[PDB]
Each structure stands twice: as structure tokens, then as C-alpha cells.
Design a protein around this ligand. Structure first.
Ligand SMILES: C#C[C@]1(C)[C@H](O)[C@@H](CO[P@@](=O)(N[C@@H](C)C(=O)OC(C)C)Oc2ccccc2)O[C@H]1n1ccc(=O)[nH]c1=O
Ligand SMILES: CCCCc1oc2ccccc2c1C(=O)c1cc(I)c(OCCN(CC)CC)c(I)c1
Ligand SMILES: [Ca+2]
Lengths: 100, 49, 284, 820
């Protein structure tokens, strides 16, 4: 439920970023997505530990589902964070927080 | 303004939307932990088992 | 300062007196080289002979220092501190009728540099080629501290189980294998020796030296890994302790950053300083 | 006579190189006889030149100077042959001076004459720097003798050759630590000589750390200076189907096919995964077959590569050579990518540029291998127990006492073993010297050579300590001097291909843009902006970061850290609230460092909540508190600038790194095909942590080999003698048939290629940074212009072009005299 709350916060941040030239809000939304996915991964890890401490198990439908969800959220958040950041300077005159 | 309407950002946002909807649907589908005692396969999940 | 009442001993310095001092420094270095250390306060005839000869060098150095101080600097204070330590050790030795204080005698060869201007300016240049490396050294220390803390929080008290024999305190290994950590009912490594079992109470892999138990030992093993001399052993031991899925990230990233990137930085800065010095001296 | 004398020299070097251990009697007779005729020919050639050119001008060249020495030494040796020459080591060392006539091959290369002239000019500086280094080594050897001399009295039977018992051994140990090979074992021995891993015992590691750091710094200084300066003088005197969619699809298919090839199962020939991989491979080949036919219908050196790849793929729908020849698929990307082709061409041009040093180094290594053959021919044999000195004595069984206890016995058969790296012939000697030049296992070879007793006899402990001169001289000459010139050659060569200060300044002025400062209104918020932006706040929170780092290092194995964690988390959360209030969340996220702080504080809050919920009723979330002192980087301007410039240089040239990635990929796949069926046995170099069974394991093995670990041990671990894996499919009766002798080529070629590529990448990054690296920090630089931009933003909140004319007057006072 903490992870889905983080997802909700990220969704509202992304929605607010599009309107009235609020371009700066794409970074907090990406970070919220990253943390929500990370909570999801640690939740599935604790579930794997619980099923281990309980013969052999099998992952067919929902474990790969949750793993794909975690990978999608993590990679999407990281890519959005990297894309929102303007650029590496690469030039002595160029630097961050410049004039657009 | 430039990184808002970029197609790459749109692709990443679409992937994030797919991931979030998949995770939302996956919080109920408890079909990942199956234990065979050895015909007593179980369905272990977050909410209900 | 003082009038011509004591400065009657400044006339031999202009004479090639420094050559005799250089030769006696070389003789003292040779005497230091031929000394044979012995365990548990043992000696031979030669060591006793060299101990008596040590006073001959001390007297010469002391009279030379007293002769130069009366007639009259960074490199002369070094001679003074060496001679003071020598005379202090000689005084202490004959009144307590410790050997650790004798380690100061390895500073005598520095007087060879002190007596030759060529090595003097060479050492000066080598020191002068070190100031630009300050930022690199700061970055190295910063990375070492971060990686030591990360290893402290990740692998603390994990490499303390190895497979002993059944009911004995003997570590179970094979012909050409060093002892490695072990894990029972986990993701680590289970021991495959027949009459062996995994239990704790094990000081560590390298006689208790290589582990992330506290900050000092974590720093030591991180520094050892950064030199790339035995980092694979640490990685393999951590893999045996906890599993070979995560730790490779830590160790490979440490090797890539603290070893290759740092070496590239050092080489670049040194090459830049060398080229700058050559271009500055070209116009001269 | 030029070609005649070169032919005589070639015959002489062939006769020298033909000598080995247990050679037939006819070979010995021929080599004995061939010495006389060739010496006579040299004498005859000398006498003709004595009249052709005269007795006076013949001695004005060092080229013909040593010929007289060579011929007179040969005559003297031949005359003393008939005497009673005992001491086989002595007669061997008088056979060593017969090898100085190998320099007639070096005598023919005139392209090294410009370099050697600078060496002869700067011989005094070379000697001075080497003398300073030698004095440093002497001082540290004396210190080690004082510290660890006579303190290695361990009751166990373990042998520790690298000790400080006397001056030669202390010098050898200090040199070994200086080379960095197995220095940690020496450090462990020194630590355990004292109490051990206790408070006063571990402080002796300071000696080893200081020795390593200072010696490596001195070594870099001396050798880099010599190489770069002498090579600069040497060069200075020298100068006096067509759409982008289709090609993108093809490249994606190249990547997919490479990934499918990489993730195979070499151990199981018939497996579930292998069939799916074969289906994917034939599906990919079907697409590539319809792609080559399309190209040739519209057109008539790179397409034949695709044709050959498709042919060898379709031929599968020694009979397995073509199975390993499909590792050429990643090489299909060279033509598609212009940058990849350009960097491949550049590295080939660099390879062809460096051709003289490689040849002279190989030839000098050949002479050193000949000397090593003369010195250690047959002397690298041994028995299981060192009490049996001969092959006939080393038979039967003997007792082995484990842990040194005389009451714990075990029986082992006695076998006459031969060292893996020896000097029996020129090829084995060259392999041993190549292993030595990589600083891998060279102490073992050194100590085996010191104990070398006789032609067919076992070792004698500390028999010949003077044999360390050979190894030390070889390391200094080859692994130190010529290797540094090779590195220095690339540096100056790339510097050649690399006013201008005014051009850079005018380019900065033309292309500069102002940066935002975010001066806030609403004076109630202006007060919090003033308190936040004040240097006192940043000093206070730098102190708090330092305190948090200090508290983080206080944890140890065998609860107060919990409350301090919460306290620090709350303090940083209050920072985040205050910054958001001051910057109104608009300019706060414009700074990447503030984004990093947001990420760190959110991670720390989640970690604290997780710890609390665990206490009410995951290990890696604690790493967020470690990254807190990463934000300390924003205050160190020099460190941040250096990191930024080198990072952007690495970003600038990604194709040079892609060459290394492709090399690793190709070699890993080849290794899985070749050595993937070797069983994992403890006590060997192929085990659970080091193998070729999976692609990640092969890549890790190659990376370990790149970083100069025990790669020659891995090379020996795969040579046609290894037990095959039980799950692998092999015919019954034979199990010890896994491994190939191809491992020698594999590992040697990989080591050379990886070293060259890493050197190329490092020099490329250095030359990219050279604008910043060779910068005068006094005349003028971009830092002054950045400070001017900062003060402008101080006087101008928003960019909005320029500012009022009256406001221009005051800011020129703040401009430094170097700029204004
Ligand atoms: C001898 C020698 C060295 C002590 C060391 O053995 C070598 C390592 O790199 P390398 O073997 N290059 C290729 C094979 C490569 O892939 O590097 C990895 C294997 C590390 O050779 C040189 C590299 C740069 C300049 C000159 C030679 O550098 C020298 N060193 C290093 C650090 C230092 O602080 N002080 C120094 O003197
Ligand atoms: C097509 C690429 C060929 C590269 C190459 O060919 C050589 C022929 C003779 C001698 C050296 C080379 C060479 C190297 O690039 C090379 C080889 C070695 I070994 C080497 O030293 C590695 C070990 N090092 C200590 C870790 C010793 C200085 C270095 I640096 C570069
Ligand atoms: Ca090594």
C-alpha cells in the first residue's frame, strides 16, 4: 500500500507537469516511480523468503508478472529522471541551470 | 518545454503507465507461490491464501 | 654574531672535508647492511663488533655537527636530528643495563642525498611534481571511505563460518585450497567434505585479517582490493559467505572506479604537468 | 657483403637458439663444430675490413667497436676450452658471453638511433633518478630488516621465502612489494609475525601501505619522465535496403543474434534451452538470407563478411570448427556504424605506428630467454618430498604430515614433477619470461631458480641467491624501461595529432549563456532564502554530514545507531522542507544536486519507516544514508571540475570502449565453446567461482585476467588433461580429455589485446582532456569567466538579455585584474 501510494503521488506529479509549463515536475514523479518499484521488489523478495522458509516451488504466472512490473517501473523511472535532466555540459561555457 | 513533448519521454511515460496498471492488477492475482507436498497445490499471496 | 673568538674552525669546510663525511656515511650504510637480525635476543660475533663500531660513527658525526654549529637550514636540521637520536640511543643503551628505538638508524642514508646537490634538486623536483595530485588523492580517500562504509553495512560478520571436521576444531580443506567462508541452509556455499560440518567461531579467511568487521579492517581490505592484488579472493569469499548474485556488482564497480579511473586520472595529471614543465623550460 | 654478413648472423642466431635440454649427441656435436667455422668467418671478415677501410677510421664507430671484443673473447674462450674447466655453472657463464654476438641483429635498425642518442645524452639524469630510487629501496629494505628481521619464527612447517632475514632477501622482498605482485602475502606474514589482527599488531601494515604508495609514485615519476622527455627529443630531432529503418532493423537483429549466441549451454549438448536457441538462430538466419539477396540485386570488403557469416550459418541448417566460427556476428556492426569503423581504422593505424618498439622488445626478450636457457636448463625438476634428489630416488610412497603434526600421517606416491614454466628450450623460456613481464607468479619462478642445483637434480634451499640478479635486471629492462617507452610513445604520438587561448576565449564569449539565480520576492520568503543561502548554513550542514559519516563508521560486529539514524533523517527532512519553502519548488528542482538530496532524503525516510515497522512486528535500503556524503562534492570545486571533465571525456568517446566490450564478448563466447566442459573441482583454478560454463562467469574470468590476477594459473588449468564435467556428454572410458592446448594462444592473445585496448582508451581520454590538463592557472581560464557569469547572475536574477547601463559600471570593480 505504501508502494501504490508512491505510485499515486508520481501519477499526480506527472499529470501536473504537463500543464502550464511545469516542466520541472517530471523529476520528482520519476523518483516516486523508482521508489514505488523498489518497494515492490523488496515486497516480492520478502514473499520469496516466506515461501522459501515454508519439495520445490514454481513461478509461472504472477511471479514473472511482479518481476516485470518491478523492472518496468524501475527502468521507466530511471529513464525519465535521466531524460528530464538537461544535459552533461561537455563544453567549458555550457553548464547546468542555464538559460533554457 | 523541450523534454515534455519529446517522443522518447512519451515512450517512457507509456511504459510507466503499463507497469503501474500491471502492478495494480498484480496485487490481487496471487498465482506465484505454488507448493506441492507430494494433489495439494496451494496459492500463496499477499492478501489471501 | 659572536666575534672572532670561536670561528677558528671554519677553514676546513672549504677544503674537501665533505668527501670524508660522504665516505663515512657510506661506511655506516654498509655496516647497517651487513647486520644480521636474530630471533629472541640472539647475536653473533659480527653483530657485537658492529655495535662497538657504531660509536665510532656517532663520535665523528657529533664532532662534525659541533664543529659546523660553532663556525656558523632544512637539510642541516636533518643531520642534527639524526645525530641527536643516535647519541640519545647510545646514552639510553648503557644506562638500562628498548630495541624498537634502534629503528631510527635507517635515516642515515638520507645524509647521502643531503651531501649531493644533484639528488637534492632531483628530490625537490619530485616533491614539486606532487602538488597537482592533491585533488586526486582527496578523491581516492573519499571513494575508499565510501566503499569501506558500504562494505561495513553489507558484509559485517558474514565471513565467520567455515566447515570444520565432525566434533573437532580442525578446518576441513583439500590439497590446494585455502580456507573459505561457509553457509548452512542458505544461499552461500555448503561444504562437500565427507566428515565435515559448518559452524561458527572462525576468526576469518586470512587468519582473521580479511573481513568487513569494523571500519579499520574494512578500509584495509578495500585498499587491498583497489591495488587489484587479491580482490578476486575477497569476492570469492563473500560469494561463499552470502551468494554470488549481488557482490560482484560491488567488487567490479570498485575495481572499475578506484583502480582504472583513478589510474587514468593520475596518468593524465602527471603527463599534463610533465608537458607543461617541458614547454616552460623550452623557452629557457 | 651486407647480405652475406646478415646471413652469417642469422646462422649464428639459429645455432644459438637450437640448444635445449636432452638434445641428441649429433646436435651437440654440430653446435660445437658450428662455433669454430662461424668464429673463423667472423675473424676473416674482420681482417678484410682492416685493409678495406684502414686501421684508424674503424674505431670511430661503436658499431664496429664491439666486433673486436666479440672476436677476441671468442678466441680466448676457444683457447681455454682445452683447459680443465670444472664448475659446470662456471663454464655455462663462460658460454653466456658467446651470446653477446646477438647484437649484430640490433645493429641493422637505424630507426632507433635517434632515441638512443637522447638516452646517451641524458644518461646522467637517468642515473641520478635511478640512484634516488635505489636509495629509497635500500632505506626501506633496512627498515624491513629492523622490523621483520628474525621475527618470522613460526612453529608451522609453512615456508615463507619472502622475508627480511638478511640484506639480499630484504631487497628482494622490497622489490617484490614494489612490483605489487603478492605483496598482500608479505603484509600478512608481517602482521602475523607480531601479535596478529590486534590493535598494535595491525599497525605494521602502515609500512607496506607507505612502501607501495611511495614506491609506485616514484616509479611513475621516474619512468614516465624519462620516456616522455627522451621521446619528445627523439621526435624533435626526427622532424629536423537504403532507408534508415532497414539498417536499424538489421542492427537490432545483429544485437539479438549476438545475445542469443551468448546465452547458450555449452555443458549440455541436447537441452531444452538449446533447441529454442537453435530455432531463434535459424529464424534470424532466414531474415539475414533475404537481406543479402536484396542488397546484391540493387548493387554489383565488408559485404563478404556478411556473406561468409550467412554461409557458415546455413551450412549448419574438424566438424565443430565452424561451430565456433559463428562468433563473427558481432563484427557485422563495424560497417553499419560509422564511428565504429572510424575507431577500428584509428586503432589499426595506431598498431602500425608502434612497430619498432614491439620488435626490439621481442628481440631483447629473445636474448634474455637464451640466457635463461643457458642458466636454468634442466634445473627445474623436483620431487614430492625434497629429500629425494634424483628421478631414480623419487619412487615409491612417502608420508605427508598435515598441519605439521607428526602424529597425523597420510600416504602419497612419490612422483618426479616438472615445473609448469621452465627454461628447457627457447620457447619455454620465452613463455616464462612473458609471464614474468606481467608480474604474475614471478616470485615463484625466482625462488625456483634460486634453488636450482644441477642438470637433473632436485632443488637445494637458497642454493644460489645471486640468480635474483637475472630476474631483477630483466624486470627493470623490459617490464619497466621498454614498457614505459611504449606507453610514452602513444602519448606523444596522440599529442602530435591533437594563437589558441584567444580563440578559446572568444568562442566562450560567443557561445556563453547566462544562468538562472532565482532571486525571490515576498520578503517573508526572502528571509528564509537569506538564511538558507548564507555560507553559515552550508558550513553547518557540511559539519552535520561529516558527523553522520563519522557515526556511520562506528558500527562493528559484536542499540544507539537507531536513534541517531532517525535524528539525522529528521534534520535532513527539515532541510528539504526549508529549501522547498525558500525556492517555492520551482527553482529547487532546477538544481541536479537538489534532486539528489530529494532522492536521498526520500530513501532515508522509507528506510526509517521500514525499520520502525520491522520493530513493530531491506538490507540495501541502508545504503541511502551512505550516499549522504556524495552531496559533499558540491563544495569541492576542483574535485567536481576534474570529475566532470573526465566523465564528459568518457562520454565523448564511447566507441573506444565498445571495442573493449566486443573483445570481451567474442573472447567469452570462444571460451565457453572451448573450455566450457571442464569440471568444477576445489583446489584448481576452474571451480564454482571461476569457470567458462555461463556467459557472466566467462566475462568475470576475462575481467579478472585483465586486472592482472593469476591468469597463467588459469591458462595451466585448461590444457588437455582435465576431468570432464559429469553432466557433459562424453564417450565412456575417457573422462580426462577436456581442455585444449589452444589455451596458450587464447590467453596470451587476450592479455596483449586487452592491454593494448586499455592503453589506447586511457590515452584517448587523456588527449581529450589535454586542454584542461595542460592549463596555466595564472594567465586566464574558463574559471574566471564562470565566476564572471556567477557575479552577473548575482546582479541579474533572470537572463532577460543584458542589464541596465548604470549597473554595468559597478560590476567591473568586482572583476579581477586578470579579467578586468
Ligand atoms: C610497471 C608497472 C606499474 C606499477 C603497474 O604494473 C602498471 C599498471 O598498468 P599497465 O600494466 N597497462 C595495462 C596492462 C592495463 O590494462 O592496466 C591494468 C593491468 C592495471 O602498465 C603501465 C600503465 C601506465 C603507465 C606506465 C605503464 O602501471 C605502473 N603503475 C601503476 C600505478 C601507480 O600508482 N604507479 C605505477 O608505476
Ligand atoms: C595487436 C595488439 C598487440 C599489443 C602488444 O604487442 C606487444 C609485443 C611486445 C611487447 C608488448 C606488446 C603489446 C602490449 O600492448 C603490452 C604488453 C604488456 I605484457 C604490457 O604489460 C602488462 C603487465 N604490466 C604489469 C601489470 C607490466 C608493465 C603492456 I602495458 C602492453
Ligand atoms: Ca598478481
Amino acid at each position: 500500500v505504501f508502494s501504490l501510494g508512491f505510485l499515486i503521488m508520481g501519477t499526480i506529479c506527472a499529470l501536473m507537469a504537463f500543464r502550464k509549463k511545469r516542466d520541472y515536475l517530471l523529476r520528482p514523479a520519476s523518483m516516486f516511480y523508482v521508489f514505488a518499484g523498489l518497494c515492490l521488489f523488496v515486497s516480492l523478495e520478502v514473499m520469496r523468503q516466506s515461501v522459501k522458509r515454508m519439495i520445490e516451488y514454481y513461478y509461472s504466472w504472477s511471479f514473472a508478472c511482479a518481476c516485470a512490473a518491478f523492472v518496468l517501473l524501475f527502468l521507466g523511472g530511471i529513464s525519465l529522471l535521466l531524460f528530464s535532466l538537461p544535459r552533461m555540459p561537455q563544453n567549458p561555457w555550457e553548464s547546468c541551470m542555464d538559460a533554457e | 518545454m523541450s523534454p515534455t513533448e519529446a517522443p522518447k519521454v512519451r515512450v517512457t511515460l507509456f511504459c510507466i503507465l503499463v507497469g503501474i496498471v500491471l502492478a495494480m492488477t498484480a496485487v490481487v492475482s496471487d498465482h506465484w507461490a505454488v507448493l506441492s507436498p507430494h494433489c495439494e497445490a496451494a496459492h500463496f499471496g499477499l492478501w489471501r491464501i | 654574531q659572536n666575534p672572532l673568538r670561536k670561528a677558528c674552525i671554519s677553514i676546513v669546510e672549504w677544503k674537501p672535508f665533505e668527501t670524508i663525511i660522504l665516505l663515512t656515511i657510506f661506511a655506516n650504510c654498509v655496516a647497517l647492511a651487513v647486520y644480521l637480525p636474530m630471533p629472541e635476543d640472539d647475536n653473533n660475533s659480527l653483530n657485537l663488533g658492529l655495535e662497538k663500531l657504531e660509536y665510532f660513527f656517532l663520535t665523528v658525526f657529533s664532532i662534525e655537527a659541533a664543529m659546523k654549529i660553532i663556525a656558523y637550514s632544512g637539510w642541516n636540521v636533518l643531520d642534527f636530528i639524526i645525530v641527536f637520536l643516535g647519541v640519545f640511543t647510545a646514552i639510553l643503551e648503557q644506562v638500562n643495563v628498548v630495541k624498537a628505538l634502534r629503528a631510527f638508524r635507517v635515516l642515515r642514508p638520507l645524509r647521502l642525498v643531503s651531501g649531493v646537490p644533484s639528488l637534492q634538486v632531483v628530490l625537490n623536483s619530485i616533491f614539486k611534481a606532487m602538488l597537482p595530485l592533491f585533488h586526486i588523492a582527496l578523491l581516492v580517500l573519499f571513494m575508499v571511505i565510501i566503499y569501506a562504509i558500504i562494505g561495513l553495512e553489507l558484509f559485517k560478520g558474514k565471513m565467520h563460518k567455515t566447515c570444520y571436521y565432525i566434533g573437532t576444531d580442525i578446518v576441513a580443506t583439500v590439497e590446494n585450497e585455502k580456507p573459505s567462508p561457509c553457509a548452512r541452509t542458505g544461499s552461500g556455499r555448503p561444504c562437500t567434505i565427507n566428515g565435515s560440518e559448518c559452524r561458527g567461531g572462525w576468526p576469518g579467511p586470512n587468519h582473521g585479517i580479511t573481513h568487513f568487521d569494523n571500519f579499520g579492517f574494512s578500509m584495509l581490505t578495500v585498499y587491498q582490493c583497489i591495488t587489484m592484488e587479491g580482490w578476486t579472493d575477497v569476492l570469492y569469499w563473500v560469494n561463499d559467505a552470502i551468494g554470488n548474485e549481488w557482490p560482484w556488482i560491488y567488487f567490479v564497480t570498485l575495481i572499475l572506479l578506484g583502480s582504472f579511473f583513478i589510474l587514468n586520472l593520475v596518468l593524465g595529471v602527471l603527463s599534463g604537468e610533465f608537458t607543461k614543465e617541458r614547454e616552460k623550460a623550452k623557452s629557457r | 657483403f651486407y647480405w652475406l654478413v646478415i646471413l652469417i648472423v642469422a646462422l649464428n642466431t639459429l645455432s644459438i637458439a637450437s640448444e635445449h635440454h636432452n638434445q641428441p649427441l649429433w646436435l651437440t656435436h654440430l653446435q660445437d663444430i658450428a662455433n669454430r667455422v662461424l668464429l673463423s668467418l667472423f675473424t676473416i671478415e674482420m681482417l678484410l675490413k682492416m685493409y678495406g677501410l684502414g686501421l684508424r677510421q674503424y674505431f670511430m664507430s661503436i658499431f664496429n667497436r664491439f666486433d673486436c671484443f666479440v672476436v677476441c673473447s671468442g678466441i680466448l674462450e676457444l683457447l681455454l676450452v682445452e683447459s680443465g674447466a670444472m664448475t659446470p655453472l662456471g663454464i655455462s657463464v663462460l658460454r653466456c658471453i658467446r651470446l653477446l654476438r646477438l647484437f649484430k641483429i640490433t645493429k641493422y635498425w637505424t630507426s632507433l638511433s635517434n632515441l638512443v642518442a637522447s638516452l646517451l645524452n641524458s644518461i646522467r639524469s637517468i642515473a641520478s633518478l635511478l640512484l634516488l630510487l635505489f636509495l629509497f629501496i635500500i632505506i626501506f629494505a633496512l627498515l624491513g630488516m629492523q622490523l621483520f628481521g628474525g621475527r618470522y619464527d613460526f612453529e608451522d612447517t609453512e615456508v615463507r621465502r619472502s622475508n627480511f632475514d638478511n640484506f639480499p632477501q630484504a631487497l628482494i622482498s622490497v622489490f617484490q612489494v614494489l612490483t605489487g605482485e603478492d605483496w598482500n602475502s608479505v603484509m600478512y606474514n608481517g602482521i602475523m609475525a607480531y601479535g596478529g589482527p590486534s590493535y598494535p599488531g595491525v599497525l605494521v601494515c602502515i609500512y607496506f601501505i607507505i612502501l607501495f604508495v611511495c614506491g609506485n609514485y616514484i616509479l611513475l615519476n621516474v619512468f614516465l619522465a624519462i620516456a616522455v622527455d627522451n621521446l619528445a627529443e627523439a621526435e624533435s630531432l626526427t622532424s629536423a535496403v537504403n532507408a534508415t529503418w532497414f539498417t536499424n532493423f538489421i542492427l537490432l537483429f545483429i544485437l539479438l543474434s549476438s545475445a542469443a549466441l551468448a546465452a547458450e549451454d555449452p555443458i549440455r549438448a541436447e537441452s531444452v534451452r538449446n533447441q529454442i536457441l537453435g530455432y531463434f538462430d535459424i529464424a534470424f538466419t532466414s531474415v539475414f538470407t533475404v537481406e543479402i539477396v536484396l542488397k546484391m540485386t540493387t548493387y554489383g570488403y565488408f559485404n563478404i563478411l556478411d556473406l561468409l557469416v550467412v554461409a557458415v550459418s546455413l551450412i549448419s541448417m574438424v566438424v565443430k570448427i565452424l561451430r565456433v566460427l559463428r562468433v563473427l556476428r558481432p563484427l557485422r556492426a563495424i560497417n553499419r556504424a560509422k564511428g565504429l569503423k572510424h575507431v577500428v581504422q584509428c586503432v589499426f593505424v595506431a598498431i602500425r605506428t608502434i612497430g619498432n618498439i614491439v620488435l626490439v622488445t621481442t628481440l631483447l626478450q629473445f636474448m634474455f630467454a637464451c640466457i635463461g636457457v643457458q642458466l636454468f636448463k634442466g634445473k627445474f625438476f623436483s620431487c614430492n618430498d625434497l629429500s629425494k634428489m634424483t628421478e631414480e630416488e623419487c619412487r615409491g610412497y612417502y608420508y605427508v604430515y598435515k598441519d605439521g603434526d607428526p602424529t597425523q600421517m597420510e600416504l602419497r606416491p612419490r612422483q618426479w614433477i616438472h615445473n609448469d614454466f621452465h627454461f628447457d628450450n627457447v620457447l619455454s623460456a620465452m613463455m616464462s619470461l612473458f609471464t614474468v613481464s606481467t608480474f604474475e607468479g614471478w616470485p615463484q619462478l625466482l625462488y625456483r631458480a634460486i634453488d636450482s642445483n644441477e642438470e637433473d637434480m632436485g632443488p637445494v634451499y637458497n642454493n644460489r641467491v645471486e640468480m635474483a640478479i637475472f630476474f631483477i635486471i630483466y624486470i627493470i629492462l623490459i617490464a619497466f624501461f621498454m614498457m614505459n617507452i611504449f606507453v610514452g610513445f602513444v602519448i606523444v604520438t596522440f599529442q602530435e595529432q591533437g594563437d589558441k587561448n584567444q580563440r578559446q576565449c572568444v568562442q566562450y564569449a560567443l557561445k556563453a549563456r547566462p544562468l538562472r539565480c532565482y532571486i525571490p520576492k515576498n520578503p517573508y520568503q526572502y528571509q528564509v532564502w537569506y538564511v538558507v543561502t548564507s555560507s553559515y548554513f552550508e558550513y553547518l550542514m557540511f559539519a552535520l554530514i561529516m558527523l553522520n559519516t563519522i557515526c556511520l563508521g562506528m558500527q562493528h560486529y559484536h542499540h544507539i545507531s537507531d536513534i541517531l539514524n532517525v535524528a539525522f533523517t529528521i534534520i535532513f527532512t527539515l532541510e528539504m522542507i526549508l529549501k522547498l519553502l525558500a525556492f517555492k519548488a520551482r527553482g529547487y528542482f532546477g538544481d541536479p544536486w537538489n534532486v539528489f538530496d530529494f532522492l536521498i532524503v526520500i530513501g532515508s525516510i522509507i528506510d526509517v519507516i521500514l525499520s520502525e515497522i520491522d520493530t513493530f512486528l531491506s538490507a540495501f535500503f541502508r545504503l541511502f544514508r551512505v550516499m549522504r556524503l556524495i552531496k559533499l562534492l558540491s563544495r569541492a570545486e576542483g574535485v567536481r571540475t576534474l570529475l566532470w571533465t573526465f566523465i564528459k571525456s568518457f562520454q565523448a568517446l564511447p566507441y573506444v570502449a565498445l571495442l573493449i566490450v566486443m573483445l570481451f564478448f567474442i573472447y567469452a563466447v570462444i571460451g565457453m565453446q572451448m573450455f566450457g566442459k571442464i569440471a568444477l573441482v576445489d583446489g584448481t583454478q576452474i571451480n564454482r567461482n571461476n569457470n567458462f560454463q555461463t556467459f557472466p562467469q566467462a566475462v568475470l574470468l576475462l575481467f579478472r585476467c585483465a586486472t592482472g590476477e593469476a591468469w597463467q594459473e588459469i591458462l595451466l588449468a585448461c590444457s588437455y588433461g582435465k576431468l570432464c564435467d559429469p553432466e557433459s556428454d562424453y564417450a565412456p572410458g575417457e573422462e580426462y580429455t577436456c581442455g585444449t592446448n589452444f589455451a596458450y594462444y587464447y590467453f596470451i592473445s587476450f592479455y596483449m589485446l586487452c592491454a593494448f585496448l586499455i592503453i589506447n582508451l586511457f590515452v584517448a581520454v587523456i588527449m581529450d582532456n589535454f586542454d584542461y590538463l595542460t592549463r596555466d592557472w595564472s594567465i586566464l581560464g574558463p574559471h574566471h569567466l564562470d565566476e564572471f557569469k556567477a557575479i552577473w547572475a548575482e546582479y541579474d536574477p533572470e537572463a532577460k538579455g543584458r542589464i541596465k547601463h548604470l549597473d554595468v559600471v559597478t560590476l567591473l570593480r568586482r572583476i579581477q585584474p586578470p579579467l578586468g
